[PDB]
Amino acid sequence: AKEGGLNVGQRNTQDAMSLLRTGDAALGSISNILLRMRDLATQAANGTNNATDTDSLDKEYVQLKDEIDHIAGKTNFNGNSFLDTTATPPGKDIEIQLSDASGDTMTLKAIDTKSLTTGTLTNLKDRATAETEITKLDTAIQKINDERATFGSQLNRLDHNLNNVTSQATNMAAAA
């Protein structure tokens, strides 16, 4: 159901929780790919690879970059590609009205996953480039960890709202 355009009620909250689980799992896949990319970059920066091995590491690394972009574009809730605000059509925020909470609204914010990950990365075409990729990969791993933390926290918050669960944090926030 809606109330002045805004989405309300238990089933709507469940839908949003489903979007959050989808987003977290997709960002989890992206994080695991970034870890594999970090391993490849570390190997390639090492100094010790010939022409063929340099090429094979670079090929796999670039394939993994493309896989991140694929996941970023394909992930959706009901056709909304919320991990890619640069898509056509762009991912958009999802608004969720909380129940018995004085009209509080949660926004699942759509993000630019590519900008946080592949937009900052290049390739392993040479040893020197591979070395500088490592730092960039560590940065991207941390950014993705924050984005997943956001979705995880929002999921907990919706779970408490939908399931009428009160915790220490609820009791603390009651006065405000």
The domain ranges of the chain are: 1-176
CA angle 119, 53, 70 (to 5 degrees): 30
DSSP secondary structure code for residue 25 in this structure: H
Spell out the alpha helix ranges (H) of the chain: 10-45, 51-74, 113-116, 127-163, 168-173
3-state class of 122 per DSSP? coil
**From CA 2, how far away is CA 7, in angstroms rounded?**
5
* Rounded distance between C-alpha atoms, residue 162 and residue 145, angstroms: 25
Which of 58, 57, 92, 97 shows the shortest CA–CA distance to 77? Answer: 92
Q: What is the resolution of this structure in A?
A: 1.9
CATH number for 1-176: choose from 3.40.50.300, 1.20.1330.10, 3.40.50.10490, 3.30.930.10. 1.20.1330.10
Contact between residue 97 and residue 123 where contact means Cβ atoms under 8 Å apart: no
β-pairing, 2-3 vs 6-7, is antiparallel
